Amino acid sequence: NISILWKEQTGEDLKYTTAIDYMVTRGIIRSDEHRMDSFMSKALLVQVLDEDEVIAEGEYLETYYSRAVDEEQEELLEDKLQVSDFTKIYTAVKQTVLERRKERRSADKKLRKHARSRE
RNA sequence: GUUGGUUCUAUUUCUAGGACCUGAUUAAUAGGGACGGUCGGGGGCAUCAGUAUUCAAUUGUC
């Protein structure tokens, strides 16, 4: 119903607010809500530039369903593929920024305590 | 059922996946073993005691 109201709807500002809310969303219920909001969002990419910031990041039966959701978001385009490649480079840049923060900070045994406590 | 490295996280918190750095019935009014308080002219060594016996000394009496 809220996606129906968002399609019925500061138009571009509220659309960016909805895309920011979907990125803040993206446990199984919230992940299904994120896939539903991405399906309600999918111009084809000129409004969806600021909406694939997390749906491509996800591209454990809930994890298998999330992988099916990522395949659904990838199937459902030249400008969209260009924005997706730029967003992949931006996620690589964010990984570089997090790695730079970690390398400047350097949980030595705590970096393996999670795996030693999991198995 | 003991190390190092990868990526994902929003208001440094706090996070997800690799490698690599010891086997399986019951517990007999069968058994041996441990433990507890014991028990016995049981044994070995060391020690203590007894009054006899023998010997010696000192006497006493015939």
Across chain A, the runs of DSSP E, i.e. the strands, are none
CA of A29 to C1' of B9 (A): 19
Instruction: Identify whether the C-beta of residue A51 lies closer than 8 Å to the C-beta of residue A41.
Output: yes
Instruction: Identify whether the C-beta of residue A55 lies closer than 8 Å to the C-beta of residue A23.
Output: no
After which residues does chain A show a gap where C to N exceeds 2.5 Å?
9, 26, 42, 59, 76, 106
DSSP state of A60: -
Cα–Cα separations (whole angstroms), residue A25 to A5, A94, A103: 18, 19, 29
Counting every residue, how long is chain A? 119
CA of A3 to C1' of B8 (A): 27
Q: How was this structure determined?
A: cryo-EM
| A118 nearest nt, CA–C1' | B1
In angstroms, the CA A18 to CA A23 distance is 9
Q: What residue has its CA nearest to the C1' of B17?
A: A115
CA of A108 to C1' of B14 (A): 15
